[PDB]
Design a protein around this nucleic acid. Structure first.
Lengths: 58, 38, 140, 176, 209
RNA sequence: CUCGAUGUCGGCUCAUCACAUCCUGGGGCUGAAGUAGGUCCCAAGGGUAUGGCUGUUCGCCAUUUAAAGUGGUACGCGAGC
RNA sequence: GUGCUGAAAGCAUCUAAGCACGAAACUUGCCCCGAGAUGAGUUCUCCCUGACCCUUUAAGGGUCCUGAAGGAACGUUGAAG
C-alpha cells in the first residue's frame, strides 16, 4: 500500500514521508490508506488529495 | 640498506620525504641509511 | 473488495532514453533500478511481474567519485577450480563496458527469476547516438 | 619557513597569451602550454603576472606556487636557451652526435643510438661529451636522464655518463 | 591466408647421406576464391575455399546451388580465410597452389588427430606405475586409483580421467618445406602432420608471430 | 561435534591451494672491482633428484641438479592400491 | 624500483599539478573448445504460392488434395566408435 503511495504521491510533489504528515493535520481529515489505492482508479481524487497534504504541510 | 623496517629520519643531511610514508634517510653521505620502508 | 490492483502481466511499458554521458555513474543505477520496477509507477502493483523500458547510451563517460576509477574488485570466477578468479580493476574493464559496470543494476535488482526479466533488457551501448542498433521508435 | 611566488616579468622576445586553464608564451625558441587549476586563473597586468586561487584554504596558495614558478622557466626557455652537458667517463666511451640520432658506444656489445625527441639539439664538442640544447627544462630533463641512465657512473670509478658537474664520490674501494 | 588439401600418406627423399628430407606428401590442389565479403553484412575479410572431386552428379544439392554465386566446380567442405590483400570475384575466382607467400620458409599444418576412442590415465598421459603379475590387485593400468579420503574435494574438476578420443584438431606449427610442384600439386614438409591419409589439413603459412 | 563405528603412521597413485620464494625474472643497500656472494623489496608463470640404511616421516651418507622451497588440504588421498 | 619538472616548505623533494620508464606476475600474442552467448548473433545457398467448413470469429478448431528442400530409415562400410 505504502509502496505504491510512495510511488504515486511523490511523482506529484512531496514524498510519502511528507504526505501522511500533511494529511496528519486535520479535524476530521484522516481517512487511512488501504483505500489509499486511489492512485489506480481515482487519480484525480488522489492528486486532489496530494494537495490536501502538500498545501497542508505548514 | 634500503631498509624495509620502520625507523625514522635520524642523522642531519638526511631528508624525510613523503611519497608513501617512507621515513627515508637520503643523504649525499651514504645511501646506507635510506630506510625506504617499501 | 480485495484491494490490490492485479497483474495485467506487464500491462504498459513506457520507453525512455537516459544519457549516461553524464557524471553520476554509480548514483544513476538506483533511479535506473527503481525505474525498471515501479518507481515513477503508481498503480501496477510491483512484487509481481512488471517493469518498464528505458535505455542507456554511451555510458563510457563515468569516473565515480574517489579513486574508484582505479579500483572495483571485479572478477568473474568460473566453475573451474584450478585456481582461477579473474580480477580486473574498473578502468581495466571500462575499456569495454560489457555485462558489468553499466550493468551495475543487476546486483541492484530482486535477482533470480522475474527480476531477471528486466535485467539487460534495457540495452546499454557505448556511443550514444549514431547507429542505434536499438529500437528507434517512441522514447523520451 | 616563509615562501612566496610572484616575480615573473615579461622581458623582450617573449609573448603572453593566457586562456584560463590553458596558456602559452611565444619567444625566440618557441612557446608551450599546459593544464592547470580549473576554477583558478592567472592575471597579466603589465610586465608581471599574478596567479591566484578563488578559494581560501590549505590546498590553495600551493597551486599558485607551482604555477608562477613554471612560467618562469618558460620565458627563460624561449629567450635564454637551455643546456646540460654530460661527460663520458670510461675508456671505450664516446658519444657522437649525428642529428636526432646520437650514436653511443658504452661498453655494451654493439653501439646504441638514442633518438632525440624533437625539441632538443645536442652536439658533443669533443668525442667525449653531450650538450643539450632546448627550451623546455622539463623535456630536456628526460633526455638528460636517459642519457646518463645509459650507464650512470658507479661509485667505484665514476666511469659512466655523469653530468658535467655531476659530483660523484667514486671514492669507494677495497676489502676489509 | 592459404589453401587446404588432403594429407595422403608421407614419405621421404632419403638424400644420399641424410634422408633429412622426411616430408609428408600433401597434394596441394588449388582452390576456388570468388567468395568473400567485407563490411556490408558479414565479418571481416575471409575467403571461401573448396577443393576435391565431389561427385557433382549426386550427393550434395543445396551446396552445389549455393556455389552458383559466380563460382566453378563445387568440391567438398568449404573453409574460410582472412586478410592478406588477395584477389576477388573481380578477376577470376580461382586461386592456385602458389603465389607470393614466399618459399623455403616454414609452413604449419593442422591434420585431424585420429582418436584411439576411449582412453585412460595410463593412455592420456603415459604415466602410472604398478605391476601385473603378483598384483592382479591394482594391475597397473588402473587410473592408479585417484582422489582423497574425507575431503572437500570435488574430485577436482578437470583432473585427467579416462576420457575418450576421436577426430580433433591439432596444429603442429613450424615445419620447413623441402619441395613443391605447382599444378602437379605436390607439397612436402618434414614429418609430423596429424591425421593419416583420411584428413584435410589447412596448411597455413606460419602464424609464428 | 561423532562411542546404534568419523579406520592409525609411513609408502604408492593422483593431486589442489597459500607465500613467510628453493631455481629461474626485476630491483635497493653492501664491509658491492670483476666473478661470485650477503641481506631486504617485488614476484606464485613454470620448474623444484636418483640411490645406501631404516616401517619410518625425518635424518645422515654416496652422487647429481638451475634448484632439490616452507606450509594448508580429516598431519590431502584405504566405498583408490 | 628509478626518475624528470615542482611547489606546499626564498632551497630541497619522484608528487601534492603534471610526464617517462619498469619483471617468467596481470591483459594480449600461440593452440584447443566455443551462439543453450535463452543477450539463443552473422552471411551465403535450397524448398513450399490447392480447396472448403463450424465455431463461442482474429483465437482458432477441422476435413480432402497435397506433400518439397531436407532428414531419417535400411543396406555395403570406415584410419570413426
Amino acid at each position: 500500500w505504502i509502496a505504491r503511495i510512495n510511488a504515486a504521491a511523490r511523482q506529484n510533489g512531496i514524498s510519502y514521508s511528507k504526505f501522511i504528515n500533511g494529511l496528519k493535520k486535520a479535524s476530521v481529515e484522516i481517512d487511512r490508506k488501504i483505500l489509499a489505492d486511489i492512485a489506480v482508479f481515482d487519480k484525480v481524487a488522489f492528486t486532489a488529495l496530494v494537495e490536501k497534504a502538500k498545501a497542508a504541510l505548514a | 640498506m634500503k631498509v624495509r623496517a620502520s625507523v625514522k629520519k635520524l642523522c642531519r643531511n638526511c631528508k624525510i620525504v613523503k611519497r608513501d610514508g617512507v621515513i627515508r634517510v637520503i643523504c649525499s653521505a651514504e645511501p646506507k641509511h635510506k630506510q625506504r620502508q617499501g | 473488495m480485495k484491494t490490490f490492483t492485479a497483474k495485467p502481466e506487464t500491462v504498459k511499458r513506457d520507453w525512455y532514453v537516459v544519457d549516461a554521458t553524464g557524471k553520476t555513474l554509480g548514483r544513476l543505477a538506483t533511479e535506473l533500478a527503481r525505474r525498471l520496477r515501479g518507481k515513477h509507477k503508481a498503480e501496477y502493483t510491483p512484487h509481481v511481474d512488471t517493469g518498464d523500458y528505458i535505455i542507456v547510451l554511451n555510458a563510457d563517460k563515468v569516473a565515480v567519485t574517489g579513486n574508484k576509477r582505479t579500483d572495483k574488485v571485479y572478477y568473474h570466477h568460473t566453475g573451474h577450480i584450478g585456481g582461477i578468479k579473474q580480477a580486473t580493476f574498473e578502468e581495466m574493464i571500462a575499456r569495454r563496458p560489457e555485462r558489468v559496470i553499466e550493468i551495475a543494476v543487476k546486483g541492484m535488482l530482486p535477482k533470480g527469476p522475474l527480476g531477471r526479466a528486466m535485467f539487460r533488457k534495457l540495452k546499454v551501448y557505448a556511443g550514444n547516438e549514431h547507429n542505434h542498433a536499438a529500437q528507434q521508435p517512441q522514447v523520451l | 619557513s616563509r615562501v612566496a611566488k610572484a616575480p615573473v616579468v615579461v622581458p623582450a622576445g617573449v609573448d603572453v597569451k593566457i586562456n584560463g586553464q590553458v596558456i602559452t608564451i611565444k619567444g625566440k625558441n618557441g612557446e608551450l602550454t599546459r593544464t592547470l587549476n580549473d576554477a583558478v586563473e592567472v592575471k597579466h597586468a603589465d610586465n608581471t603576472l599574478t596567479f591566484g586561487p578563488r578559494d581560501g584554504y590549505a590546498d590553495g596558495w600551493a597551486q599558485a606556487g607551482t604555477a608562477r614558478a613554471l612560467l618562469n622557466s618558460m620565458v627563460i626557455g624561449v629567450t635564454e636557451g637551455f643546456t646540460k652537458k654530460l661527460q663520458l667517463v670510461g675508456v671505450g666511451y664516446r658519444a657522437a652526435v649525428k642529428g636526432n640520432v646520437i650514436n653511443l658506444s658504452l661498453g655494451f656489445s654493439h653501439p646504441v643510438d638514442h633518438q632525440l625527441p624533437a625539441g632538443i639539439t645536442a652536439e658533443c664538442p669533443t668525442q667525449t661529451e653531450i650538450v643539450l640544447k632546448g627550451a623546455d627544462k622539463q623535456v630536456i630533463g628526460q633526455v638528460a636522464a636517459d642519457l646518463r641512465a645509459y650507464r650512470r657512473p658507479e661509485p667505484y670509478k665514476g666511469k659512466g655518463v655523469r653530468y658535467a658537474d655531476e659530483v660523484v664520490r667514486t671514492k669507494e674501494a677495497k676489502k676489509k | 591466408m592459404i589453401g587446404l588439401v588432403g594429407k595422403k600418406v608421407g614419405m621421404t627423399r632419403i638424400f644420399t647421406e641424410d634422408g633429412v628430407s622426411i616430408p609428408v606428401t600433401v597434394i596441394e590442389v588449388e582452390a576456388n576464391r570468388v567468395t568473400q565479403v567485407k563490411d556490408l553484412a558479414n565479418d571481416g575479410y575471409r575467403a571461401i575455399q573448396v577443393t576435391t572431386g565431389a561427385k557433382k552428379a549426386n550427393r550434395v544439392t543445396k551446396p552445389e546451388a549455393g556455389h552458383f554465386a559466380k563460382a566453378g566446380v563445387e568440391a567438398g567442405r568449404g573453409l574460410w580465410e582472412f586478410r592478406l590483400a588477395e584477389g576477388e570475384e573481380f578477376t577470376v575466382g580461382q586461386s592456385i597452389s602458389v603465389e607470393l607467400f614466399a618459399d623455403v620458409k616454414k609452413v604449419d599444418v593442422t591434420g585431424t588427430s585420429k582418436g584411439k576412442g576411449f582412453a585412460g590415465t595410463v593412455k592420456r598421459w603415459n604415466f602410472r606405475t604398478q605391476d601385473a603379475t603378483h598384483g592382479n590387485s591394482l594391475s597397473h593400468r588402473v587410473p592408479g586409483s585417484i582422489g582423497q579420503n574425507q575431503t572437500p574435494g570435488k574430485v577436482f574438476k578437470g583432473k585427467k580421467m579416462a576420457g575418450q578420443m576421436g577426430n580433433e584438431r591439432v596444429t603442429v606449427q613450424s615445419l620447413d618445406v623441402v619441395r613443391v610442384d605447382a599444378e602437379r600439386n605436390l607439397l612436402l614438409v618434414k614429418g609430423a602432420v596429424p591425421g593419416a591419409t583420411g584428413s584435410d589439413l589447412i596448411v597455413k603459412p606460419a602464424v609464428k608471430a
